[PDB]
């Protein structure tokens, strides 16, 4: 009843803590989003 999750997004921050998200749609109530922590670099 679900499409595949999208790829995880880039980190919302280019340094320091941020969020990454992905989403899936029905193809089943409605769309779903998953969110996680990310940190790709220390800020200067
Ligand atoms: C993405 O690239 C990084 C290397 C930094 O230049 C980022 O800028 C910094 O972003 C943070 C918020 O994530 C701000 O607190 C700083 O002011 C800023 O230098 C950039 O967005
Ligand atoms: C998304 O989540 C996982 C892949 O990370 C699987 O359960 C499936 O592909 C779903 O669409
Ligand atoms: C999110 O997580 C895996 C593990 O890195 C990624 O490779 C993929 O893009 C998925 O969206």
């Amino acid at each position: 009843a679900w499409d595949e999750w999208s790829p995880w997004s880039l980190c919302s921050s280019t340094c320091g803590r941020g969020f990454r998200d992905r989403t899936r749609t029905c193809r089943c109530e409605g769309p779903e989003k998953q969110t996680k922590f990310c940190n790709i670099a220390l800020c200067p």
Side-chain angles (χ1 to χ4, degrees):
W2 287 114
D3 291 312
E4 275 284 320
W5 288 107
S6 70
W8 284 104
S9 70
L10 293 183
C11 188
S12 62
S13 293
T14 56
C15 63
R17 184 177 310 127
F19 300 95
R20 277 192 215 276
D21 298 80
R22 64 176 193 172
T23 57
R24 65 176 179 176
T25 47
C26 296
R27 202 179 168 263
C28 189
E29 208 164 351
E32 298 190 338
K33 179 195 285 274
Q34 196 163 341
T35 303
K36 68 184 179 179
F37 173 94
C38 54
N39 187 346
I40 68 174
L42 290 187
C43 292

